[PDB]
Amino acid sequence: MDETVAEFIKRTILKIPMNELTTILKAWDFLSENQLQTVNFRQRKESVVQHLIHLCEEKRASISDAALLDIIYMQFHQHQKVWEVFQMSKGPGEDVDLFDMKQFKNSFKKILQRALKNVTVSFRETEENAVWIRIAWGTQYTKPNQYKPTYVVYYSQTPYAFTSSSMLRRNTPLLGQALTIASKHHQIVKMDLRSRYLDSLKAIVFKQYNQDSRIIHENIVEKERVQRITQETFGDYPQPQLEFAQYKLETKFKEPLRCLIKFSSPHLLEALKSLAPAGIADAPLSPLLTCIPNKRMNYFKIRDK
Amino acid sequence: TPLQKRLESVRKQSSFILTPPRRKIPQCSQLQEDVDPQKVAFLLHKQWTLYSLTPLYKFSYSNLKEYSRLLNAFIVAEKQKNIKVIFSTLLGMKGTQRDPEAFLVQIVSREGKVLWTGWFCCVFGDSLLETVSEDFTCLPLFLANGAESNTAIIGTWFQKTFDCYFSPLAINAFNLSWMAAMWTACKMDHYVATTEFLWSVPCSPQSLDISFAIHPEDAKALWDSVHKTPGEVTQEEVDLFMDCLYSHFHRHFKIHLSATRLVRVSTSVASAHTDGKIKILCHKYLIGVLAYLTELAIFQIE
């Protein structure tokens, strides 16, 4: 029920698919149980995106909760808008005895509006104990832009704070700065982990993923070996990186020979696992390629050694 | 002579007699005669989806307005099932003087929003001219870039009026590696883009793709390592360039790139895919890149 708010809600309501209309509209709380029956969710897309936004016209929707709608949309569509991983680092001392979600919301919004005075920061403390910050940016010269927001999934007391790599503007060093000063840390470092599957980045940065008689195969002693070495490097249930696992090679050919390798698969760490047994790869499959989760890194910048 | 010459050509091609085409490094093709600088420059950095086009029966480079109207009235009728069609002879996209002049087919929508911009060219394609009669103006190459829907409509119109048939030209990874090698062998300066080779491993469950993007000057110095005979690149030299890539990739990641297939070879000269959406023409070597592309289209036609 406002400029860049009502039509913003319209643009985020045609984004959400028809199946999970109830799921996202129930969680953002503006449509109570009585309001759900008024609109027939099963009829049409333009019908619902017109009646629902009217149901907020009577509900006088504001950007503070319109952005929360976008948050809840992305919580089920986090597998888009490839995510950078920021890693905080406190120095020597005790941990953050005060991460009050109210205090963190204050210490983040205050620092962000200290310089980026026109931003619509909207938090959503999820049930997995990970505040799902969404930031619509805009300098003092412009209104906060909700067209391209920068969602930041900060796990509540974790040194790691995922970030939607939207545009990587001059706010990115302020995104990390506000993040590391709201949560009582000192150094913000981009881990350089950049994947589209946040549910896999969560696994990686937390190490949370692993916790006939006639056909005489003459190279059976080699197939057994290659299967063995592909089970002590890729143990069980690898997580889908699905990311351009770059290897910006700077090595001499055996002065350097610059390369910018980009492994690109819908499911990378499983694609590598089925390489050596398929004959494409050697059995010891180059730890540069096996230690993507073990190093918690895929955007490599290797050199010679 | 009118057909039997083509039958003997088919015999020679199917014979497969010692093929390795030692190819001349694409020479700097100073833009011949007119070659409308605005038009050609507009035609360079556009991702042409190649097709193989059989010779057009009863075509003439005088009746461009009649074909323009006949096709415009057909495209908008396929919308019944706002658009202007401008056939435009390019006047310079030809290898030898006897080649048919390349001509465009642009779906111009109000303003000059060229939706489709078709392109038929026959450059250095004198393996088809000397085998087809005079009535056919043969342009083996067809270049789409517009949506596949409009291409699959203008192709139908061309089949209906000219008896020409569009097989989607698919550059096999062998020809792709060849062109990836002769384009890092060129004598260009100020390399526009890195020499990227998009591999795609043949895994059954998963579809991992590799972008072995080399620094364009670094690949030129790697090519000079395997380049010994000047003037012409051989199949062994191309294979040694590709094997130096293989022995710099399997060296690093222990996965045999030679066990994979090229899908796209981006180069400062011209990007080139496999599945058809192939020829981006970054530099003005397009009379040589198009020479290779037409020579490949003959392979599919003949």
């Binding site: 090595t251 180059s286 730890p287 540069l288 290797i302 050199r303 010679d304 050694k305 | 060296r251 690093h252």
Partner: peptide
């Protein structure tokens, strides 16, 4: 080392 073999 940085296993560049």
């Amino acid at each position: 080392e940085f296993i560049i073999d």
